[PDB]
Structure formats: structure tokens, C-alpha cells
């Protein structure tokens, strides 16, 4: 098969699970960890894609052993680039984000922690979570390259997790 440079883990945080939640994200579940190109397709095409997820669902794909959390120590000093999509219109962009990540396509790919798609009421969001937020040059490269991979033709912002940790403002914009 075709071994990936890294192992990745799919997590769901479902509305149902959130309903039972003790704290934010305590509900998040690692569903599956894949290590090859073929194993990716195997699990990916057998799970819910954002266009078929209920409002409130968060769907993650993160490097193995990284928790998708501000307070995860690998994530702590990082941030996120965010793209916005209309309801039901993010599936293909979700996929390319994933294939770009697992294929290690980003020039500055070492900073990459993972991505998430957030299914909401009016729209859907995709964010890439990165590691070394203060490395503007890295983050700016990544975001620019992500637009290119997505053919996203709108401005996108990078928000530091620190700052996050709704009145959080974009530190960078591409």
C-alpha cells in the first residue's frame, strides 16, 4: 500500500454527545486512526461527510495523538485558518483539505496539527489548525497554499488559540 508520512485520527463531536457533555469537548470521540492512503479511503467513504451531518456536528482529522484542543500542548501555541462554505457545499473542499494534509502537500507542513469541519445552522466552516502561530511566515504560506488548494477566493483569517482561549480577532489575513 501507500504509507502516509503520518498517522491521522478521525474524531466526531456529535450533537447527541454534546447533549450529555460535562465540559466543552469532553464528548469528542476518536473513531479511527489510519496510516495508509488506501485505509484513508476505506474509512473516509464509510463515514458521514459534512453535507449529511446534523447542525452542531464537528468532524476532525488530526495527526495521531494530537487532541483537537486549544489546551492540547502541541496545539497550545498555535492557531487556525478558517474558510466558510454554504450549507451542503463543503464536502469537496473538506476532502481536498484532507488529501492536502495527509499527502503532506504543504510547504510548511510540519506546523499542521489537523483540520475540522463545523456544521452549523447558516453555514459550514473548515479550519486548519497549526502549531507555531508566531511564525507568521509559516502560517501565511500555509493559508495561501490552502486557498490555492481549495480555489477559495475570499479573504481568510488566522486566529491564535491563545486569543481564542468570539471576541477573538484575526492576527493574519490572506
Numbering used by the authors: 52 to 216, 220 to 228
Sentences reproduced from the published study:
Hence, allelic variation in genes for the translation factor eIF4E has accounted for differential susceptibility of their hosts to Pepper mottle virus (PepMoV), Pepper vein mottle virus (PMMV), Potato virus Y (PVY), Tobacco etch virus (TEV), Lettuce mosaic virus (LMV), Barley mild mosaic virus (BaMMV), Barley yellow mosaic virus (BaYMV), Bean yellow mosaic virus (BYMV), Zucchini yellow mosaic virus (ZYMV;) and Pea seed-borne mosaic virus (PSbMV). Resistance-breaking isolates of these viruses are not uncommon and comparative genetic and molecular analyses have identified the virus-genome linked protein (VPg) as the predominant avirulence factor. This is supported by in vitro biochemical and yeast two-hybrid assays that point to a direct interaction between VPg and the product of the dominant eIF4E susceptibility allele (eIF4ES), which does not occur with the resistance variant, eIF4ER. In this paper we describe this structure and report the impact of a series of point mutations in and around the cap-binding pocket of pea eIF4E on infection with PSbMV, and use the protein crystal structure to provide a three-dimensional framework for interpreting these data. The monomer is comprised of a central 8-stranded anti-parallel β-sheet flanked by α-helices, although one face of the β-sheet is largely undecorated by α-helices and this is where the cap-binding site resides.
In preparation for a structure-function analysis of pea eIF4E in relation to PSbMV susceptibility we determined the crystal structure of pea eIF4EΔN51 by molecular replacement, using the wheat orthologue as a template. We therefore designed a version of the pea protein truncated at the position equivalent to that used for the crystallization of the wheat protein. The pea protein was co-crystallised with the cap analogue m7GTP. The X-ray data revealed eight independent copies of eIF4E in the crystallographic asymmetric unit, which assemble as two distorted tetramers, and within each tetramer a maximum of approximately 600 Å2 of protein surface is buried between pairs of subunits. Since only monomers were detected in solution, we conclude that these assemblies are simply crystal packing artefacts. The cap-binding pocket of eIF4E structures are characterised by a pair of tryptophan residues (W75 and W121 in the pea protein), which form π-stacking arrangements with the 7-methyl-guanine moiety (m7G) of the cap. These residues are located on the β1–β2 and β3–β4 loops, respectively, defining, in our views, the left and right hand sides of the pocket. The m7GTP ligand is further stabilised in the cap-binding site by a van der Waals contact with W180 on β5, and additional polar interactions with E122 on the β3–β4 loop, R171 on β5, and K176 on β6. A superposition of the wheat structure with chain H of the pea structure gives a root mean square deviation of 0.708 Å over 171 structurally equivalent residues.
